[PDB]
Amino acid sequence: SKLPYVGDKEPLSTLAAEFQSGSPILQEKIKLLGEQYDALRRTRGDGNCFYRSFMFSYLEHILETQDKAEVERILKKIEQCKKTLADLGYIEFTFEDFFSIFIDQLESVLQGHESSIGAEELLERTRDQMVSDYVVMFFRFVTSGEIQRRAEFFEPFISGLTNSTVVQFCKASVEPMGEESDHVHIIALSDALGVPIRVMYLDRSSCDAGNISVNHHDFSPEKPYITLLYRPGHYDILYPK
Amino acid sequence: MQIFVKTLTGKTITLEVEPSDTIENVKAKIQDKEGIPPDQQRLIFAGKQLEDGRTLSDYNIQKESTLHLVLRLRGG
């Protein structure tokens, strides 16, 4: 209600405080996570957390890496996504501002020119509604385009998940702001942009009780340079040690 | 018998089962081959999600049927 879309970096101990009167499996997994990860950054529970986490993670990665070649690569992928949206019948009037706002942020985190920004201003922009929500919406359009482009491949997964056709799913569950995401969204966004993602899965799962670890899921369109924390219902950003 | 499980990356996992295998048993086989905790798996056959209690015959999953696997990753 009063919380920002994206929080400050926090030591992992703040995560352990959330569970210190819950399950010991979770406390032990958070111990191990502390072994492998320095910090986390929370995102707001408004339904957009996967896209918000991905957005900030990626923009901050470009800021700190200054990887101009990765930017050239992704810009090519974004052009291709514009073309598939048009081929699907979306006119530019329906999505152009979302693309141009994200491209502006991407170019801004690159150093050495007039409108270059630093980390504090990047956090300001990802906390501002009229920038952050538009970038989230950019990612939702990209996701929707990739899902519909591959409708035939995604069809049986989606109809099992939701008893919806692929277009119904895109319209009702991908494009609206505030709609939670799931496995299909992550695969589609990761493939459409060609950026890998590691999701650390923090749950009560165990196979040998007394032998517990945090398992993960990789999306690799070489460890992923985007790492997210998943707990059932919610995504945040993790920082490796 | 053999069945196949398609994943969202385009991979097919082949498994050995009988019609009297639980859905839990199938997820444990999937963990054996892929390392995915059964708690995190969602199995689909013909537009319906398969329930842990029931078995392969209940969903009429026959010889060389194809299931679909999605991970439990819903999040806001």
Side-chain angles (χ1 to χ4, degrees), chain A residues 24-64 66-78:
Chain A
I25 301 253
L26 287 162
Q27 315 190 49
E28 180 52 37
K29 288 188 182 186
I30 287 168
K31 230 170 148 184
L32 311 178
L33 227 36
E35 274 166 24
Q36 262 267 51
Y37 289 87
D38 269 316
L40 79 156
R41 196 189 291 268
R42 299 176 185 266
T43 68
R44 164 112 282 263
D46 63 359
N48 302 300
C49 57
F50 165 71
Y51 292 113
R52 197 90 62 189
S53 296
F54 179 86
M55 158 194 76
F56 185 89
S57 219
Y58 183 80
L59 288 173
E60 181 189 45
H61 171 249
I62 300 298
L63 207 228
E64 302 191 337
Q66 288 299 297
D67 190 336
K68 199 167 218 303
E70 160 62 23
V71 170
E72 314 279 51
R73 186 204 64 76
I74 195 155
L75 287 178
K76 284 150 37 214
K77 296 304 281 170
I78 293 176

Coordinates of all heavy atoms in Angstrom, one line a residue, chain A residues 24-78, unseen atoms left out:
Chain A
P24 N 11.1 -25.3 10.0 CA 12.6 -25.4 10.0 C 13.2 -25.7 8.7 O 14.3 -25.3 8.4 CB 12.8 -26.5 11.0 CG 11.5 -26.8 11.7 CD 10.5 -26.4 10.8
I25 N 12.5 -26.5 7.8 CA 13.0 -26.7 6.5 C 13.3 -25.3 5.8 O 14.4 -25.1 5.3 CB 12.0 -27.4 5.6 CG1 11.7 -28.8 6.2 CG2 12.6 -27.6 4.2 CD1 12.4 -30.0 5.5
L26 N 12.4 -24.4 5.9 CA 12.6 -23.1 5.3 C 13.7 -22.3 5.9 O 14.5 -21.6 5.2 CB 11.3 -22.3 5.4 CG 10.2 -22.8 4.5 CD1 8.8 -22.4 4.8 CD2 10.5 -22.4 3.0
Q27 N 13.9 -22.4 7.3 CA 15.0 -21.7 7.9 C 16.3 -22.2 7.5 O 17.3 -21.5 7.2 CB 14.8 -21.7 9.4 CG 13.4 -21.4 9.9 CD 13.2 -21.3 11.4 OE1 14.0 -20.6 12.0 NE2 12.2 -22.0 12.0
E28 N 16.4 -23.5 7.3 CA 17.7 -24.1 6.9 C 18.0 -23.8 5.4 O 19.1 -23.4 5.1 CB 17.6 -25.6 7.0 CG 18.9 -26.4 6.6 CD 20.2 -25.8 7.2 OE1 20.1 -25.3 8.4 OE2 21.2 -25.7 6.5
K29 N 17.0 -23.8 4.6 CA 17.2 -23.4 3.2 C 17.6 -21.9 3.1 O 18.5 -21.5 2.3 CB 15.9 -23.6 2.4 CG 15.6 -25.1 2.1 CD 14.4 -25.2 1.1 CE 14.1 -26.7 0.9 NZ 13.0 -26.9 -0.1
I30 N 17.1 -21.1 4.0 CA 17.5 -19.7 4.0 C 18.9 -19.5 4.5 O 19.7 -18.6 4.0 CB 16.5 -18.8 4.8 CG1 15.2 -18.7 4.0 CG2 17.0 -17.5 5.1 CD1 14.0 -18.2 4.9
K31 N 19.3 -20.3 5.4 CA 20.7 -20.4 5.8 C 21.6 -20.7 4.6 O 22.6 -20.0 4.3 CB 20.9 -21.5 6.9 CG 21.7 -21.1 8.1 CD 21.6 -22.2 9.2 CE 22.8 -22.3 10.0 NZ 22.8 -23.5 11.0
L32 N 21.3 -21.7 3.8 CA 22.1 -22.1 2.7 C 22.1 -21.0 1.6 O 23.2 -20.7 1.0 CB 21.6 -23.4 2.1 CG 21.4 -24.6 3.0 CD1 20.8 -25.8 2.3 CD2 22.7 -24.9 3.7
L33 N 20.9 -20.4 1.4 CA 20.8 -19.3 0.5 C 21.8 -18.2 0.9 O 22.5 -17.6 0.1 CB 19.4 -18.8 0.5 CG 18.7 -18.5 -0.8 CD1 19.1 -19.4 -2.0 CD2 17.2 -18.5 -0.6
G34 N 21.8 -17.9 2.2 CA 22.8 -16.9 2.7 C 24.2 -17.3 2.4 O 25.1 -16.5 2.2
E35 N 24.5 -18.6 2.4 CA 25.8 -19.1 2.0 C 26.1 -18.7 0.5 O 27.2 -18.3 0.2 CB 25.9 -20.6 2.1 CG 26.3 -21.1 3.5 CD 26.1 -22.6 3.6 OE1 26.1 -23.4 2.6 OE2 25.9 -23.1 4.8
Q36 N 25.1 -18.8 -0.4 CA 25.4 -18.6 -1.8 C 25.0 -17.1 -2.3 O 25.5 -16.8 -3.4 CB 24.6 -19.6 -2.6 CG 25.4 -20.8 -3.1 CD 26.0 -20.6 -4.4 OE1 26.7 -19.5 -4.7 NE2 25.8 -21.5 -5.3
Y37 N 24.3 -16.3 -1.5 CA 23.8 -15.1 -2.0 C 24.0 -14.0 -0.9 O 23.8 -14.2 0.3 CB 22.3 -15.2 -2.4 CG 22.2 -16.0 -3.7 CD1 22.0 -17.4 -3.6 CD2 22.2 -15.4 -4.9 CE1 21.9 -18.2 -4.8 CE2 22.1 -16.2 -6.1 CZ 21.9 -17.5 -6.0 OH 21.8 -18.3 -7.2
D38 N 24.4 -12.8 -1.4 CA 24.7 -11.7 -0.5 C 23.5 -11.0 0.0 O 23.4 -10.5 1.1 CB 25.6 -10.7 -1.3 CG 27.1 -11.0 -1.1 OD1 27.5 -11.2 0.1 OD2 27.8 -10.9 -2.0
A39 N 22.5 -10.8 -0.9 CA 21.4 -9.8 -0.7 C 20.2 -10.2 -1.5 O 20.3 -11.0 -2.4 CB 21.9 -8.4 -1.0
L40 N 19.1 -9.6 -1.2 CA 17.9 -9.7 -2.0 C 17.3 -8.3 -2.1 O 17.6 -7.4 -1.3 CB 16.8 -10.7 -1.5 CG 15.9 -10.2 -0.3 CD1 14.6 -11.0 -0.3 CD2 16.6 -10.3 1.0
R41 N 16.5 -8.1 -3.1 CA 15.7 -6.9 -3.3 C 14.3 -7.3 -3.6 O 14.0 -8.0 -4.5 CB 16.3 -6.1 -4.5 CG 15.9 -4.7 -4.5 CD 16.4 -4.0 -5.8 NE 17.8 -3.8 -6.0 CZ 18.5 -2.7 -5.6 NH1 17.8 -1.7 -5.0 NH2 19.8 -2.6 -5.9
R42 N 13.4 -6.7 -2.7 CA 12.0 -7.1 -2.8 C 11.3 -6.4 -3.9 O 11.7 -5.2 -4.2 CB 11.3 -7.0 -1.4 CG 12.0 -7.8 -0.3 CD 11.4 -7.6 1.0 NE 12.1 -8.4 2.1 CZ 11.8 -9.6 2.5 NH1 10.7 -10.2 2.0 NH2 12.6 -10.2 3.4
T43 N 10.2 -7.0 -4.4 CA 9.3 -6.3 -5.3 C 7.9 -6.3 -4.7 O 7.6 -7.3 -3.9 CB 9.3 -6.8 -6.7 OG1 8.7 -8.1 -6.7 CG2 10.7 -6.9 -7.3
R44 N 7.1 -5.4 -5.1 CA 5.8 -5.2 -4.5 C 4.8 -6.3 -4.9 O 4.8 -6.7 -6.1 CB 5.2 -3.8 -4.9 CG 3.7 -3.5 -4.7 CD 3.5 -2.5 -3.6 NE 3.6 -3.1 -2.3 CZ 2.6 -3.6 -1.5 NH1 1.4 -3.5 -2.0 NH2 2.9 -4.1 -0.3
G45 N 4.0 -6.7 -4.0 CA 3.0 -7.8 -4.3 C 1.7 -7.3 -4.9 O 0.7 -7.2 -4.3
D46 N 1.9 -6.8 -6.2 CA 0.8 -6.2 -6.9 C 0.4 -7.1 -8.1 O -0.3 -6.6 -9.0 CB 1.1 -4.8 -7.4 CG 2.3 -4.7 -8.3 OD1 2.9 -5.8 -8.6 OD2 2.7 -3.6 -8.7
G47 N 0.9 -8.3 -8.2 CA 0.7 -9.2 -9.3 C 1.7 -9.1 -10.4 O 1.7 -10.0 -11.3
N48 N 2.6 -8.1 -10.4 CA 3.5 -7.8 -11.4 C 4.9 -8.2 -11.1 O 5.9 -7.9 -11.8 CB 3.5 -6.3 -11.8 CG 2.2 -5.8 -12.2 OD1 1.6 -6.3 -13.2 ND2 1.7 -4.8 -11.5
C49 N 5.1 -9.0 -9.9 CA 6.5 -9.1 -9.3 C 7.4 -9.8 -10.3 O 8.6 -9.5 -10.2 CB 6.4 -9.8 -8.0 SG 5.6 -11.5 -8.1
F50 N 7.0 -10.8 -11.1 CA 8.0 -11.5 -11.9 C 8.6 -10.5 -12.9 O 9.8 -10.4 -13.1 CB 7.4 -12.6 -12.7 CG 8.2 -13.1 -13.9 CD1 9.5 -13.7 -13.7 CD2 7.9 -12.8 -15.2 CE1 10.3 -14.1 -14.7 CE2 8.7 -13.1 -16.2 CZ 9.9 -13.8 -16.0
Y51 N 7.7 -9.7 -13.6 CA 8.1 -8.7 -14.6 C 8.9 -7.6 -14.0 O 9.8 -7.1 -14.5 CB 6.9 -8.2 -15.3 CG 6.2 -9.2 -16.2 CD1 5.0 -9.7 -15.9 CD2 6.9 -9.7 -17.3 CE1 4.4 -10.7 -16.7 CE2 6.3 -10.7 -18.1 CZ 5.1 -11.2 -17.8 OH 4.5 -12.1 -18.6
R52 N 8.4 -7.1 -12.8 CA 9.2 -6.1 -12.0 C 10.6 -6.5 -11.7 O 11.6 -5.8 -11.8 CB 8.3 -5.7 -10.8 CG 8.7 -4.3 -10.2 CD 7.9 -3.2 -10.7 NE 6.4 -3.3 -10.5 CZ 5.5 -2.5 -11.1 NH1 5.9 -1.5 -11.8 NH2 4.2 -2.7 -10.8
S53 N 10.7 -7.8 -11.1 CA 12.0 -8.3 -10.8 C 12.9 -8.4 -12.0 O 14.0 -8.0 -12.0 CB 11.8 -9.7 -10.1 OG 11.1 -9.6 -8.9
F54 N 12.3 -9.0 -13.1 CA 13.1 -9.1 -14.3 C 13.6 -7.8 -14.8 O 14.7 -7.6 -15.2 CB 12.3 -9.9 -15.3 CG 13.0 -10.0 -16.6 CD1 13.9 -11.1 -16.8 CD2 12.9 -9.1 -17.7 CE1 14.6 -11.3 -18.0 CE2 13.6 -9.2 -18.9 CZ 14.4 -10.3 -19.0
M55 N 12.6 -6.8 -14.9 CA 13.0 -5.5 -15.4 C 14.1 -4.9 -14.6 O 15.1 -4.4 -15.2 CB 11.7 -4.5 -15.2 CG 12.1 -3.0 -15.2 SD 10.7 -2.0 -14.7 CE 10.7 -2.3 -12.9
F56 N 14.0 -4.8 -13.3 CA 15.1 -4.2 -12.5 C 16.4 -4.9 -12.6 O 17.5 -4.3 -12.7 CB 14.7 -4.0 -11.1 CG 15.7 -3.1 -10.3 CD1 15.6 -1.8 -10.3 CD2 16.7 -3.8 -9.7 CE1 16.5 -1.0 -9.6 CE2 17.7 -3.0 -9.0 CZ 17.6 -1.6 -8.9
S57 N 16.3 -6.3 -12.4 CA 17.5 -7.1 -12.5 C 18.2 -6.8 -13.8 O 19.4 -6.6 -13.8 CB 17.0 -8.6 -12.5 OG 17.9 -9.4 -11.8
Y58 N 17.5 -6.8 -15.0 CA 18.2 -6.7 -16.2 C 18.7 -5.3 -16.4 O 19.9 -5.1 -16.9 CB 17.2 -7.0 -17.4 CG 17.9 -7.0 -18.7 CD1 18.7 -8.0 -19.2 CD2 17.8 -5.9 -19.6 CE1 19.3 -8.0 -20.4 CE2 18.4 -5.8 -20.8 CZ 19.2 -6.9 -21.2 OH 19.8 -6.8 -22.4
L59 N 17.9 -4.2 -16.2 CA 18.5 -2.9 -16.3 C 19.7 -2.6 -15.4 O 20.7 -2.0 -15.8 CB 17.3 -1.9 -16.0 CG 16.3 -1.8 -17.1 CD1 15.1 -0.9 -16.7 CD2 16.9 -1.3 -18.4
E60 N 19.7 -3.1 -14.2 CA 20.8 -3.0 -13.3 C 22.0 -3.8 -13.8 O 23.1 -3.4 -13.6 CB 20.4 -3.5 -11.9 CG 21.5 -3.4 -10.8 CD 21.1 -4.0 -9.5 OE1 20.5 -5.2 -9.5 OE2 21.3 -3.4 -8.4
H61 N 21.7 -5.0 -14.4 CA 22.8 -5.7 -15.0 C 23.5 -4.9 -16.1 O 24.8 -5.0 -16.2 CB 22.3 -7.0 -15.6 CG 23.4 -7.8 -16.4 ND1 23.3 -7.9 -17.7 CD2 24.5 -8.4 -16.0 CE1 24.3 -8.6 -18.2 NE2 25.1 -8.9 -17.1
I62 N 22.8 -4.3 -16.9 CA 23.4 -3.5 -18.0 C 24.1 -2.3 -17.3 O 25.3 -2.0 -17.8 CB 22.4 -3.0 -19.0 CG1 21.7 -4.2 -19.7 CG2 23.0 -2.1 -20.1 CD1 22.6 -5.1 -20.5
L63 N 23.5 -1.6 -16.4 CA 24.2 -0.5 -15.7 C 25.6 -1.0 -15.1 O 26.6 -0.3 -15.4 CB 23.3 -0.1 -14.5 CG 23.4 1.4 -14.0 CD1 23.5 1.5 -12.5 CD2 24.5 2.2 -14.7
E64 N 25.6 -2.1 -14.4 CA 26.9 -2.5 -13.8 C 27.8 -3.1 -14.8 O 29.1 -3.0 -14.6 CB 26.6 -3.4 -12.6 CG 25.6 -2.6 -11.6 CD 25.5 -3.4 -10.2 OE1 25.7 -4.6 -10.2 OE2 25.2 -2.7 -9.2
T65 N 27.3 -3.9 -15.8 CA 28.2 -4.5 -16.7 C 28.7 -3.6 -17.8 O 29.8 -3.8 -18.4 CB 27.5 -5.8 -17.3
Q66 N 27.8 -2.6 -18.2 CA 28.1 -1.7 -19.3 C 28.3 -2.5 -20.6 O 29.0 -2.2 -21.5 CB 29.3 -0.8 -19.1 CG 29.0 0.3 -18.1 CD 27.8 1.2 -18.5 OE1 27.9 1.8 -19.6 NE2 26.7 1.2 -17.8
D67 N 27.5 -3.6 -20.7 CA 27.7 -4.6 -21.8 C 26.9 -4.1 -23.1 O 25.8 -4.5 -23.3 CB 27.2 -6.0 -21.4 CG 27.5 -7.1 -22.4 OD1 27.7 -6.8 -23.6 OD2 27.6 -8.2 -21.9
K68 N 27.6 -3.2 -23.8 CA 26.9 -2.6 -25.0 C 26.5 -3.6 -26.0 O 25.5 -3.5 -26.8 CB 27.7 -1.5 -25.6 CG 27.0 -0.5 -26.5 CD 27.8 0.7 -26.8 CE 27.0 2.0 -26.8 NZ 25.8 1.9 -27.8
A69 N 27.3 -4.7 -26.1 CA 27.0 -5.8 -27.1 C 25.7 -6.5 -26.8 O 24.9 -6.9 -27.7 CB 28.2 -6.7 -27.3
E70 N 25.5 -6.8 -25.5 CA 24.3 -7.4 -25.0 C 23.1 -6.5 -25.4 O 22.0 -7.0 -25.7 CB 24.3 -7.7 -23.5 CG 23.0 -7.9 -22.8 CD 22.2 -9.1 -23.4 OE1 22.8 -10.0 -24.0 OE2 20.9 -9.0 -23.2
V71 N 23.3 -5.2 -25.3 CA 22.2 -4.2 -25.6 C 21.9 -4.3 -27.1 O 20.7 -4.3 -27.5 CB 22.6 -2.8 -25.1 CG1 21.7 -1.8 -25.7 CG2 22.7 -2.8 -23.6
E72 N 22.9 -4.3 -27.9 CA 22.7 -4.5 -29.4 C 21.9 -5.7 -29.7 O 20.9 -5.7 -30.5 CB 24.0 -4.5 -30.1 CG 25.0 -3.4 -29.7 CD 24.7 -2.0 -30.3 OE1 23.6 -1.5 -30.3 OE2 25.7 -1.4 -30.9
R73 N 22.3 -6.8 -29.1 CA 21.6 -8.1 -29.2 C 20.2 -8.0 -28.9 O 19.3 -8.4 -29.6 CB 22.3 -9.2 -28.4 CG 21.8 -10.6 -28.6 CD 22.1 -11.4 -27.4 NE 21.4 -11.0 -26.2 CZ 20.1 -11.2 -26.0 NH1 19.4 -11.8 -26.9 NH2 19.5 -10.7 -24.9
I74 N 19.9 -7.5 -27.7 CA 18.5 -7.5 -27.2 C 17.7 -6.5 -28.1 O 16.5 -6.8 -28.3 CB 18.4 -7.2 -25.7 CG1 17.0 -7.5 -25.2 CG2 18.7 -5.7 -25.4 CD1 16.9 -7.8 -23.7
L75 N 18.2 -5.4 -28.5 CA 17.5 -4.5 -29.4 C 17.1 -5.2 -30.7 O 16.0 -5.0 -31.2 CB 18.4 -3.3 -29.7 CG 18.6 -2.3 -28.6 CD1 19.5 -1.1 -29.1 CD2 17.2 -1.7 -28.2
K76 N 17.9 -6.1 -31.2 CA 17.5 -6.9 -32.4 C 16.3 -7.8 -32.0 O 15.4 -7.9 -32.8 CB 18.7 -7.7 -32.9 CG 19.7 -6.9 -33.7 CD 21.2 -7.4 -33.6 CE 21.2 -9.0 -33.5 NZ 22.2 -9.6 -32.7
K77 N 16.4 -8.4 -30.9 CA 15.3 -9.3 -30.5 C 14.0 -8.5 -30.3 O 12.9 -9.0 -30.6 CB 15.6 -10.0 -29.2 CG 16.7 -11.0 -29.3 CD 16.5 -12.0 -30.4 CE 15.5 -13.1 -30.0 NZ 15.0 -14.0 -31.1
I78 N 14.1 -7.2 -29.8 CA 12.9 -6.4 -29.6 C 12.3 -6.0 -30.9 O 11.1 -6.0 -31.0 CB 13.3 -5.2 -28.7 CG1 13.7 -5.7 -27.3 CG2 12.2 -4.1 -28.6 CD1 14.3 -4.6 -26.4

